[PDB]
Design a binder for this molecule. Structure first.
Ligand SMILES: [Ca+2]
Length: 74
């Protein structure tokens, strides 16, 4: 299952100089809807609003957040 971060969690812990919350939210939405199939997530990505991201860029962002949430929720 895809983790769900709170707004406060994002603000305190999940910022990245190269990602908006809007884009991160989009990644996590696609991750839910497409069952973590990163080829599909990559295909369906709103490359209009957001930068061209590699599949690898998307996975690294997702699992950085997973690791950070695991830690702060301990
Ligand atoms: Ca799902």
């Amino acid at each position: 299952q895809v983790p769900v971060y709170s707004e406060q969690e994002y603000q305190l812990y999940l910022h990245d100089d190269a990602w908006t919350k809007a884009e991160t939210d989009h990644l996590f939405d696609l991750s839910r809807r497409f069952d973590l199939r990163f080829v599909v997530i990559h295909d369906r990505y709103d490359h209009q609003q957001f930068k061209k991201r590699s599949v690898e860029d998307l996975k690294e962002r997702y699992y950085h957040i997973c690791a950070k949430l695991a830690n702060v929720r301990a």
